[PDB]
From Swiss-Prot, chain B:
The lineage of its organism: Eukaryota, Metazoa, Chordata, Craniata, Vertebrata. This is Protein unc-13 homolog A. It is found in: Cytoplasm; Cell membrane; Presynaptic cell membrane; Presynaptic active zone. Plays a role in vesicle maturation during exocytosis as a target of the diacylglycerol second messenger pathway. Involved in neurotransmitter release by acting in synaptic vesicle priming prior to vesicle fusion and participates in the activity-dependent refilling of readily releasable vesicle pool (RRP). Essential for synaptic vesicle maturation in most excitatory/glutamatergic but not inhibitory/GABA-mediated synapses. Facilitates neuronal dense core vesicles fusion as well as controls the location and efficiency of their synaptic release. Changing I120N: Abolishes binding to RIMS1. The C2 domains are not involved in calcium-dependent phospholipid binding. The C-terminal region containing both MHD domains and the third C2 domain is required for synaptic vesicle priming activity. The gene is Unc13a. Expressed in brain, with highest levels in the olfactory bulb, striatum, cerebral cortex, hippocampus and cerebellum. Also expressed in pancreatic islet cells. Residues 1-96 form the C2 domain.
Length: 121, 127
């Protein structure tokens, strides 16, 4: 198999285009057939400040970041971003994150964002 | 249209102490999930309903093994809604072999590949 590197993901916070009462969200991280998830946090600018480690042994494909609106009976996708593994930075240094725009006639477009750090060590 | 999904049970290849699994159902940007059940032949017998306005898409089914820090996917299938029949109640279900990963067409799932030895028993019908 491949030699193991640790993928360290810092789920910092998000910024949603909408009202406080409309978002109670969690973040799911999916990579290499596994997933880990934050707690749900209420608001337009939720803060999680949670770090995750994944043991990675191949550099193909990506890290999928999903932001979900929690519900009682079903959860609803807020949006998602995909981050190819190969160009995640190789460093032991925690970063502040980068702002990533989530992928979802006369209405204004809606753009939701997540602040996310990732680095290999 | 009202899609009804009966998540019946599964049969895994492996020792029973290795599994504490749940089923996630995704359709039209929503998701619902069963409870976790232990063993190599877990029974959930849980029925779900989804309001559909895109009959051209599919239902993604994922089986996950619950862990403390991370969860591991046991496998997945994608059922095109065009294959689901009309009925007024749940049938005994069909066995589907779980595949290891989705095929992505332009960032959207369009199928699955690489069969496992694991299977799930599912009923789906429209009402």
């Amino acid at each position: 198999g491949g030699v193991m590197s640790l993928l360290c993901v810092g789920v910092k916070k998000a910024k949603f285009d909408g009202a406080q009462e409309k978002f109670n969200t969690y973040v799911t991280l999916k990579v290499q057939n596994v997933k880990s998830t934050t707690i749900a946090v209420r608001g337009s600018q939720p803060s999680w400040e949670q770090d995750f480690m994944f043991e990675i042994n191949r550099l193909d494909l990506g890290l999928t970041v999903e932001v979900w609106n929690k519900g009682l009976i079903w959860d609803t996708m807020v949006g998602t971003v995909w981050i190819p593994l190969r160009t995640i930075r190789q460093s032991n240094e925690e970063g502040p994150g980068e702002w990533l725009t989530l992928d979802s006639g006369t209405k204004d477009p809606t753009f939701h964002r997540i602040l996310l750090d990732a680095h290999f060590e």
